[PDB]
Design a protein around this motif. Structure first.
Motif, PDB file in Angstrom:
ATOM      1  N   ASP A  44       0.788  -1.228   0.000  1.00  0.00           N
ATOM      2  CA  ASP A  44       0.000   0.000   0.000  1.00  0.00           C
ATOM      3  C   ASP A  44       0.821   1.278   0.000  1.00  0.00           C
ATOM      4  O   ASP A  44       0.338   2.296  -0.501  1.00  0.00           O
ATOM      5  N   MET A  60      -3.465  -7.475  -3.945  1.00  0.00           N
ATOM      6  CA  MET A  60      -3.834  -6.536  -2.893  1.00  0.00           C
ATOM      7  C   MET A  60      -5.263  -6.745  -2.424  1.00  0.00           C
ATOM      8  O   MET A  60      -5.537  -6.626  -1.221  1.00  0.00           O
TER       9      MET A  60
ATOM     10  N   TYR D 234      -9.636   1.365  13.648  1.00  0.00           N
ATOM     11  CA  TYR D 234      -8.755   0.229  13.404  1.00  0.00           C
ATOM     12  C   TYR D 234      -8.129   0.254  12.013  1.00  0.00           C
ATOM     13  O   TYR D 234      -7.079  -0.365  11.808  1.00  0.00           O
ATOM     14  N   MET D 235      -8.742   0.956  11.061  1.00  0.00           N
ATOM     15  CA  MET D 235      -8.243   1.023   9.696  1.00  0.00           C
ATOM     16  C   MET D 235      -8.545   2.401   9.130  1.00  0.00           C
ATOM     17  O   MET D 235      -9.371   3.145   9.670  1.00  0.00           O
ATOM     18  N   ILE D 240      -3.709   8.425   2.383  1.00  0.00           N
ATOM     19  CA  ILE D 240      -3.083   7.667   1.305  1.00  0.00           C
ATOM     20  C   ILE D 240      -3.467   6.192   1.395  1.00  0.00           C
ATOM     21  O   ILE D 240      -3.514   5.490   0.377  1.00  0.00           O
ATOM     22  N   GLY D 241      -3.793   5.708   2.597  1.00  0.00           N
ATOM     23  CA  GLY D 241      -4.365   4.381   2.721  1.00  0.00           C
ATOM     24  C   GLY D 241      -5.827   4.332   2.324  1.00  0.00           C
ATOM     25  O   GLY D 241      -6.301   3.309   1.820  1.00  0.00           O
ATOM     26  N   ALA D 244      -6.249   4.721  -1.838  1.00  0.00           N
ATOM     27  CA  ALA D 244      -5.367   3.880  -2.646  1.00  0.00           C
ATOM     28  C   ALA D 244      -6.146   2.909  -3.528  1.00  0.00           C
ATOM     29  O   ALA D 244      -5.746   2.643  -4.667  1.00  0.00           O
ATOM     30  N   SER D 245      -7.239   2.343  -3.011  1.00  0.00           N
ATOM     31  CA  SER D 245      -8.004   1.373  -3.794  1.00  0.00           C
ATOM     32  C   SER D 245      -8.797   2.058  -4.897  1.00  0.00           C
ATOM     33  O   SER D 245      -9.080   1.455  -5.941  1.00  0.00           O
ATOM     34  N   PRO D 303     -22.393  -5.094  13.515  1.00  0.00           N
ATOM     35  CA  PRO D 303     -21.239  -5.644  12.785  1.00  0.00           C
ATOM     36  C   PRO D 303     -21.401  -7.075  12.280  1.00  0.00           C
ATOM     37  O   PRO D 303     -20.626  -7.509  11.423  1.00  0.00           O
ATOM     38  N   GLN D 330     -15.951  -2.110  -1.327  1.00  0.00           N
ATOM     39  CA  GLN D 330     -15.347  -2.312  -0.020  1.00  0.00           C
ATOM     40  C   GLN D 330     -16.191  -1.637   1.048  1.00  0.00           C
ATOM     41  O   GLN D 330     -16.641  -0.501   0.869  1.00  0.00           O
ATOM     42  N   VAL D 331     -16.397  -2.334   2.160  1.00  0.00           N
ATOM     43  CA  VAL D 331     -17.174  -1.815   3.278  1.00  0.00           C
ATOM     44  C   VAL D 331     -16.217  -1.239   4.315  1.00  0.00           C
ATOM     45  O   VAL D 331     -15.148  -1.804   4.579  1.00  0.00           O
TER      46      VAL D 331
END
Lengths: 170, 150, 420, 420
Positions: A44, A60, D234-235, D240-241, D244-245, D303, D330-331
């Motif tokens: 990433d 990925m 947590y994410m 940039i993270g 990215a997708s 959840p 993506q969730v």
């Protein structure tokens, strides 16, 4: 590559609950989680020439889906149940029981105890691809291994015990 | 492990009264716990003091305790755990009371039920029955994990 | 499966408008398409399910020289029907020629809803026979739809015009429509303006505002003909399994109507079947006989009485039929809806294949034959004559509809086992 | 990691003003920059924290022939944004030439905050395409920032102007900006004034005061796009993270928006993920397909349901995509803030790479091509002509943006394996 043993300090009124063999199980799930964060961040932080990007998204997505499986589906479901269970503690012994019945099932849902060389080694040897591809920045010989090992992972996991179908889509 | 022993049953005691004895015993093992335990004891203590065995009094006291346990066990079952909804679900799926779903399940899963049986066909017909449940889009919550195909 | 309705023409848009409004009131739908607080029914076949529960009909509204379609647009229900699929003469040839130029965009309007559905089952047309713009365009669209969808079926809710006989080219227009329908419609349900008008004079004093009030009668028939599909249960869940019993020959696919409480504003099943077989409740104006009879009842109906009722009606013999088929009367059951009035607690309808409708076909054929010998209205308009210089499509339509009349009377004959 | 917002131009200073005010209300901050009296949220990422009471945000305000920046200054929030960094035509070339002379002092204003802050992730530009003073100066500043910070990344919150097409040189201005952004912007989030206006006419009756009310819509998007970085999780606590997708290829870095309760003034995750994929919630006005989709939800979210909900969206297939990438929807999950209204308890947004924005690019390219053939507004002003005598930067921009259009449609093609 697999080290970094972590410990902590427990006072005596808590020492009977968080035992010495408890720290090791917590350290185990910490080590495997760090390897997953390693592969996820390593693929990433960077940003037939562009043909590498096809392999990039094709790998990925897989490592991201495994991380989204483990943390959300296991490391947050049983924890959300576990807090609602420890708020009704009424006994010295059943607190140990409700804690051990969190540990010995989070070590089973995250596949680390048994069937290691049957299932878990496949996830390990495909994490080695997330190392090897991350260093190089032979390409045709990567997809022949990657499609084979991904299809090996699905055609080994297809025996599904029932909770692996949450990740069996991909 | 709870049943009548007919060979040991006294002859002047009939089988019907002992069947009522069996029923109240199986029920209280498995009420309205209003404590007539001592008053029925006071009924049975009084019945002990009588010299001579009378059957119609013995029939009357057990059938009193027979009806009182069955009047409750009805009220607990039909109201708290309503049976009329349960019998509706049984007719809807065992007796083909749901026509839109069971016609669509035959339509969608026609070839794979045609093919001969083999160990992996079980999961295939369940997900198609699950697809058939959402093909007929009428879907509430739960209603579905109380039924599968074998 | 899900069914897309092709309402076209001014009269057909009127009856489709009213039909969807009655299903709005009957189902749990507001004039804005939203579910209401007050409201178990298979809603999906007749209503697209949106995200925020906006049950929008899969209605395709076609306007041609629009007047009443603007009146359809300024309604409280205009938000209910929003698939956004409304696209802009009194002769059949004018309607056909006007439909040919816009066929591709109105067909793309068909394609979009066909993509939206999971599986398509049929196209039900609110068609107006001899309806000026409606006729011609409806026959052309009918001819396109079976070619593009050969596995699929087309039903036609034809309002066959009998107004005691203004359109002077009405027999010509209706004559061409009936040829197109006989070869290119799998099913047709027939209705008659004079029969609905005589029923209007029977049940009420309404004579002059005949169309506006007959809209409600047509809409009651149209709703009750689909109730058993719309509601759950194992009573004829799909359209085609209901369709097959009513239509026993490829040629004879025309279906007559009737309603036991014409004044629907307790009664047992024996009573409602016996009342249904009488000719006052029928809404249609040599031996003659039914080919096959079906009925559907909705209400507080006892279940054990229905076999005694079926035997009792059979011994009464109120319905006389001697077809080539071995077909019998069939009694079916459905549930009356909540939230609406449950007045006339038991209430029913019939659909049947009867040879008497061949006389109503022969009436406009007789009017056409007289008008065709006179040539009083060939119209000679340049649209009419450039479209048909030979004027031979009327003669092909005449020979096809004459085949239909002969086939009906041959079905009355004992030997429709042979060719009709 | 802290971020510094380079709000520039009148419109961009308006939306940056409103974005920082929304985050003052959303975090525990008062109008002075002093802490809120009621006050888990990490305010360090967007607000410089000191033992000085004023938690001053990292906001860079640039004024060019200032009017609305004085209105920004006479606000109760003027003590909040105090990094003391505000420094004193409707053509792109005039804005560029005005930026070139003050580039060193505005860049020293950049340098001072870069030195004072710990580690700067990126520079956020509240950019106005064809925004008179905003365009031109934003393109020049965009060209300077990547040279001076080659490792660092630049995002653009572009308000792409579509007002049903007053600026007569608007296609020229926008055309030059899009070349500068396609080569010198790592990431761009696109917004449309027509689409926000149609949403304004949908949710409210607001038509004439369109800009002032659309400011709130833009600010809701801008806040919810950064909530996962704002609040610890947590994410996805780094931008940039997060982004990215969504960008699979450096050329196609343009991102669409949408919001499930557009009227955010219980709902399950199945329903909100379903509602997000409907075109009314989308805020943007040959086969076409997404390349990658992402969603973030904030509120009372269960959840255990999210995997079944992901499977339900997979079953429903409301979002059609066939990209060259194998990318998936993506969730993601975040926490709704306290102290503000929790109305519409579950509430969400989407960001996605979709090929339909190439049509919106092609629209201003088509307007430019027509205007370029006419030469009706070359402007011929001595600034414009002395800056570009050749007028060939417009042709360079045309060939670059035409490469971008072809790249989008080549991403739709099966052969992005060939060069787009």
């Amino acid at each position: 590559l697999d080290g970094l043993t972590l410990s902590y300090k427990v006072p005596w009124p808590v020492d009977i609950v968080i035992s010495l063999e408890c720290q090791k199980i917590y350290n185990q799930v910490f080590l495997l989680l760090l390897q997953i964060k390693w592969a996820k961040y390593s693929l990433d932080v960077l940003l037939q020439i562009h043909r590498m990007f096809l392999l990039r998204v094709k790998l990925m997505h897989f490592v991201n889906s495994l991380h989204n499986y483990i943390m959300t589906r296991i490391l947050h479901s049983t924890g959300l149940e576990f807090q609602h269970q420890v708020e009704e503690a009424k006994d010295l012994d059943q607190l140990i029981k409700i804690h051990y019945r969190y540990l010995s099932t989070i070590h089973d849902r995250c596949l680390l105890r048994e069937k290691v060389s049957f299932v878990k080694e496949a996830i390990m040897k495909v994490l080695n691809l997330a190392l090897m591809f991350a260093d190089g920045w032979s390409i045709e010989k990567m997809e022949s291994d990657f499609k084979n090992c991904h299809m090996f992972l699905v055609t080994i996991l297809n025996k599904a015990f029932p909770h692996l179908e949450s990740l069996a889509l991909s | 492990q709870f049943s009548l022993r007919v060979e040991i049953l006294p002859s002047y005691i009939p089988v019907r009264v002992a069947e009522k004895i069996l029923f109240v015993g199986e029920s209280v093992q498995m009420s309205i716990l209003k404590n007539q335990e001592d008053t029925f004891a006071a009924e049975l203590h009084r019945l002990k003091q009588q010299p001579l065995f009378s059957l119609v009094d013995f029939e009357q006291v057990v059938d009193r305790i027979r009806s009182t346990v069955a009047e409750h066990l009805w009220k607990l079952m039909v109201e708290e755990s309503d049976l009329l909804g349960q019998l509706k679900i049984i007719k809807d799926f065992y007796l083909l009371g749901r026509g839109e779903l069971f016609q669509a399940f035959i339509d969608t899963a026609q070839h794979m039920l045609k093919t001969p049986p083999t160990a992996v066909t079980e999961h295939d017909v369940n997900v198609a029955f699950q697809q058939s449940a959402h093909k007929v889009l009428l879907d509430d919550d739960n209603l579905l994990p109380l039924l599968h195909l074998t | 499966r899900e069914i897309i309705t092709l309402q076209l023409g001014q009269c057909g848009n009127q009856i489709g408008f009213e039909f969807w409004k009655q299903l709005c009131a009957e189902h749990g739908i507001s004039p804005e398409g939203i579910v209401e607080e007050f409201a178990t029914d298979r809603k999906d076949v007749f209503f697209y399910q949106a995200d925020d529960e906006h049950y929008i009909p899969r209605a395709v509204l076609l306007d041609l020289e629009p007047r009443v379609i603007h009146s359809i647009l300024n309604s409280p229900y205009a938000k209910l029907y929003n698939p956004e699929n409304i696209y802009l003469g009194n002769n059949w040839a004018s309607g056909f020629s006007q439909g040919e130029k816009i066929h591709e965009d109105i067909f793309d309007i068909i394609d979009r809803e066909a993509d939206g559905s999971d599986s398509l089952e049929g196209f039900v047309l609110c068609h107006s026979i001899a309806g000026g713009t409606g006729s011609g365009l409806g026959s052309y669209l009918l001819e396109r739809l079976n070619d593009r969808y050969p596995k699929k079926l087309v039903q036609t809710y034809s309002v066959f015009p009998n107004q005691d006989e203004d359109v002077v080219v009405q027999p010509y227009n209706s004559l061409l429509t009936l040829k197109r329908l006989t070869q290119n419609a799998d099913c047709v349900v027939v209705l008659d303006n004079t029969a609905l008008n005589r029923i209007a004079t029977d049940r009420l004093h309404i004579q002059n505002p005949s169309f506006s009030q007959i809209n409600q009668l047509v809409s009651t028939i149209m709703s009750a003909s689909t109730t058993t599909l719309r509601y759950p249960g194992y009573m004829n869940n799909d359209l085609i399994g209901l369709i097959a019993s009513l239509i026993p020959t490829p040629r004879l696919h025309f279906l007559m109507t009737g309603y036991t409480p014409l004044t629907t504003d307790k009664t047992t099943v024996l009573d409602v079947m016996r009342r249904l077989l009488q000719p006052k409740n029928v809404m249609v104006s040599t031996n003659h006989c039914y080919i096959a009879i079906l009925n559907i009842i909705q209400g507080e109906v006892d279940p054990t009485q229905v076999h005694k009722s079926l035997q009792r009606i059979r011994e009464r013999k109120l319905a006389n039929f001697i077809p080539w088929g071995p077909a019998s009367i069939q009694v079916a059951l459905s549930r009356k809806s909540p939230y609406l009035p449950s007045a006339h607690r038991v209430s029913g309808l019939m659909m049947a294949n009867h040879t008497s409708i061949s006389s109503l076909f022969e009436r406009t054929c007789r009017q056409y034959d007289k008008l065709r010998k006179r040539e009083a209205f060939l119209e000679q308009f340049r649209k009419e004559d450039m479209f048909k210089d030979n004027f031979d499509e009327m003669d092909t339509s005449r020979e096809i509809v004459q085949q239909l009349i002969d086939e009906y009377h041959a079905a009355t004959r004992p030997d429709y086992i042979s060719w009709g």
